[PDB]
């Protein structure tokens, strides 16, 4: 009476040099996201994604209750960004935290376009959460 369900999350970011006045201080535009692979719908099992920005940002706790799960910002430095993916789960685990390396392109390097692929293994999900994981394009491994 085991079942294991695997789902994939993609965390990623894009960064490039910003174009505004010498006197506006942000050197970069960036974008950070959480998504499913092609033809998966992670909204079936994801309640919300919380992006914890550097304390220097206004409202550093950025919440996406629905897709797209992303933050678009301007900034002057990279930082380590905690990213919490909350589940539509009534038991443990209720969420996963990732520590995301939000690094910028320095000294005339090309734009950054990074992806981090995370495989989540749910052991013995409740019947309802199992269904959500599968609706999202999750796979039974037993
Ligand atoms: C280690 C470190 C890393 C990043 C920052 C940073 O970029 N801070 C920062 C602080 C305030 C900001 N405000 C913006 C602009 N957004 C525009 C859209 C919503 C309002 C703020 N970008 C901002 C960026 C500061 C440090 I020291």
Swiss-Prot record:
Residue ranges crossing the lipid bilayer per the database entry: none
Top-level taxonomic group: Eukaryota
Swiss-Prot/TrEMBL site (Acylated histone binding) positions: 101
Region (Acylated histone binding): 54-56, 76-78
Involvement in disorder: A chromosomal aberration involving MLLT1 is associated with acute leukemias. Translocation t(11;19)(q23;p13.3) with KMT2A/MLL1. The result is a rogue activator protein.
Subunit structure: Component of the super elongation complex (SEC), at least composed of EAF1, EAF2, CDK9, MLLT3/AF9, AFF (AFF1 or AFF4), the P-TEFb complex and ELL (ELL, ELL2 or ELL3). Interacts with ALKBH4. Component of a SWI/SNF-like EBAFb complex, at least composed of SMARCA4/BRG1/BAF190A, SMARCB1/BAF47/SNF5, ACTL6A/BAF53A, SMARCE1/BAF57, SMARCD1/BAF60A, SMARCD2/BAF60B, SMARCC1/BAF155, SMARCC2/BAF170, ARID1B/BAF250B, MLLT1/ENL and actin.
Role summary: Chromatin reader component of the super elongation complex (SEC), a complex required to increase the catalytic rate of RNA polymerase II transcription by suppressing transient pausing by the polymerase at multiple sites along the DNA. Specifically recognizes and binds acetylated and crotonylated histones, with a preference for histones that are crotonylated. Has a slightly higher affinity for binding histone H3 crotonylated at 'Lys-27' (H3K27cr) than 'Lys-20' (H3K9cr20). Acts as a key chromatin reader in acute myeloid leukemia by recognizing and binding to acetylated histones via its YEATS domain, thereby regulating oncogenic gene transcription.
Protein name: Protein ENL
Originating organism: Homo sapiens
């Amino acid at each position: 009476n085991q079942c294991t369900v695997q789902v994939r999350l993609e965390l990623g970011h894009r960064a490039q040099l910003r174009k505004k006045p010498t006197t506006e201080g942000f050197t970069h535009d960036w974008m950070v996201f959480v998504r499913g692979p092609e033809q998966c719908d992670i909204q079936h099992f994801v309640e919300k994604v919380v992006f914890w920005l550097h304390d220097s940002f206004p409202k550093p706790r950025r919440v996406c209750k629905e897709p797209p799960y992303k933050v678009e910002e301007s900034g002057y430095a990279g930082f380590i960004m905690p990213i919490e993916v909350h589940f539509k789960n009534k038991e443990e685990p209720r969420k996963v935290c990732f520590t995301y390396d939000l690094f910028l392109n320095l000294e005339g390097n090309p734009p950054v376009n990074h992806l981090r692929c995370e495989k989540l293994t749910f052991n013995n999900p409740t019947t309802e959460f199992r269904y959500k994981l599968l609706r999202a394009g999750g796979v039974m491994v037993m």
